[PDB]
Design a protein around this ligand. Structure first.
Ligand SMILES: Cc1ncc(COP(=O)(O)O)c(/C=N/[C@@H](C[C@H](O)CNC(=N)N)C(=O)O)c1O
Ligand SMILES: [Mg+2]
Ligand SMILES: [Mg+2]
Lengths: 360, 353
């Protein structure tokens, strides 16, 4: 459903249904990172099968708990999720996935034969993970606990105490924690710290794609102990083998020049959060949300349980060209996902047309 | 990481600037948006691929991150319990290892140098069940260089269609025939509805690192592979996509240099065979970037000779034990002839001991 909507309306002029920020052109990004003149001397032979040292050092430099040898660069975290769950699969294993979340986090394990146990997060509870309700789902057969923080679609950041309880549940059942830290670069602190150092059972996923305006580079990474890195590196030979030295190199300069990129998008998000709080006040209780704390998305809802966002989302895109992602893509029919990393004129235009559809 | 690597199956790879000076796509890259690429691959790339064969249309193609991803997705969607796949060996290890990870039963068709590493269709038909879902047809062959003949293809088509099995034709090296007349080998995709074709610019055009390949099939297999690619990489970069498209559109500015290097090295290796006076032989390759010669002495272990060669001389050959052919070794033809000749003289020195 997430792919059904975002592909059918990929070319609409007012697209708020995606989770990436406004993407650069290659020339725009190179004017900020300064990596242009170095590209022509890059060899088109196979890249380092872990990713180049330049990229792994830039990733490792972000956290004192991370060293360059802990990192395996992948073609987005979509590949990293696939290889990680493949390596961890055994017969009779289950995984715990809080939902709403990115569909790949529970659909890939289902394809691989895992038993998938869902922890339904709810807006009434602030989309927060209750560790006593999480502890009900964790077996000795539970091998992976998915921890998407900042959350897609809600934007909720796990608190330090929530993390400590989840660490305790995982270590008790000897389960690993797959911490998808995609949106750590856009707090609403400069960046959120990685969870990789907090427990030996934590494996971290990261990427430049959503936060830096370069989703198309297809660069992600996995952080883990040497044994899980060796096992994932082995199986990546049967997925894509390597990523291109150019994508690798361009993403490295992005992280090394994050100060030229992330603040401008933070200001863009902060204005749009204000624009949506204005919209919530004007709607007088019809629209509410769990306020997001970090990332690129929000998951507001109609307070009337009868309204289907898909019906409102359909009329909005056909009559006005404005795309919102209906919450059915997350099994939350009253919610909808809205993109925060867009130009505020575009964000406000969408609210103005959404108001028109609400009236009529 | 040794400096004199003849163990790879790619040709001498360009730098990005060297490749762009031949295709002319440099100035166009800066206006490309870093939003998601077309989830089928760009039209420019899919049209450039389709233009190579009259049987291929732009809508038949799914661009992937190398054929490694195409192999993974194709075998994944086709898997069912009790299925088997038939793999002629020696071949590229992914062609039988990925189906093994996915739960397929793998039936190996042993190819032999005595028979020229050619496919025996009557012995192949002994391996094909009603449970056989895929028949792997890597032509030109890695490592031998063998090109499947027109009659061999029709026999394989006959066995597959009789048992309702599909044919996975890994046509990676179709861009480097060794005969002077034809420029590139034709795609097998038009010959039967059971044929799914894999291609790539990587090994033949000196840009293996771009990670660009493609899969060709009927709309249901294209729709099914496109669906599962959402769980592998979703898309390939618009930049790599765009560069590979310009490579295909300017193949005439690229392939001739590699053709001359391969034939020059085949000639140098034929000279080396004459000097060795029967100790070295090979099935002469017909197309591609590699050869699979062997020692005629049953006592020589290529792994030992390859080991001494790389430690004392810095020259890497791929020992045939990697293909369960201990007397063989794989040597790269797409290197500079001066490097190819350096390797032969040093391999001769190692042979004298
Ligand atoms: C937390 C989180 N982790 C990982 C990924 C995968 O993104 P990536 O790491 O592979 O770039 C996403 C992707 N969110 C996008 C979908 C992609 O844009 C398209 N679908 C695939 N790429 N499979 C969206 O939800 O709208 C995500 O939100
Ligand atoms: Mg560090
Ligand atoms: Mg055509």
């Amino acid at each position: 459903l997430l792919e059904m909507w975002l592909s059918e309306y990929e070319r609409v002029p007012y697209n708020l249904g995606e989770s990436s920020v406004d993407n650069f052109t290659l020339g725009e990004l190179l004017n900020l990172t300064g990596d242009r003149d170095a590209l022509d001397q890059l060899s088109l032979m196979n890249n380092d099968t872990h990713g180049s040292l330049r990229l792994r050092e830039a990733i490792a430099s972000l956290d004192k708990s991370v060293s360059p040898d802990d990192i395996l660069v992948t073609a987005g975290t979509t590949e990293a999720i696939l290889i990680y769950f493949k390596v961890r699969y055994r017969s009779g294993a289950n995984v715990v996935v809080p939902v709403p979340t990115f569909h790949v986090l529970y659909e890939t394990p289902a394809f691989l034969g895992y038993e998938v146990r869902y922890l339904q997060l709810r807006a009434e509870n602030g989309f927060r993970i209750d560790p006593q309700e999480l502890a009900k789902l964790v077996d000795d057969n539970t091998e992976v606990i998915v921890l998407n923080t900042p959350q897609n679609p809600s934007g909720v950041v796990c608190s330090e105490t929530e993390i400590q309880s989840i660490i305790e549940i995982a270590e008790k059942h000897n389960a690993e924690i797959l911490a998808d830290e995609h949106y750590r670069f856009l707090p609403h602190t400069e960046i959120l710290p990685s969870l990789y150092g907090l427990s030996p059972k934590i494996i971290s996923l990261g990427s430049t794609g959503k936060c830096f305006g370069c989703i198309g580079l297809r660069i992600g990474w996995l952080i883990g102990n040497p044994e899980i890195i060796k096992a994932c590196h082995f199986f990546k030979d049967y997925t894509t083998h390597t990523v291109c030295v150019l994508n690798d190199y361009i993403a490295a300069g992005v992280l090394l020049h994050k100060g030229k990129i992330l603040p401008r998008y933070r200001q863009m998000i902060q204005h749009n959060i204000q624009q949506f709080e204005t919209f919530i006040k004007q709607q007088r209780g019809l629209i509410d949300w769990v306020k997001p704390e970090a990332g690129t998305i929000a998951f507001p809802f109609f307070t009337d349980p009868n309204i289907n966002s898909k019906i409102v989302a359909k009329r909005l895109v056909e009559d006005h060209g404005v795309l919102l992602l209906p919450g059915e893509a997350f099994d939350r029919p009253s919610h909808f996902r809205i993109a925060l990393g867009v130009e505020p004129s575009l964000f406000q235009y969408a609210l103005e047309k959404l108001a028109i559809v609400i009236e009529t």
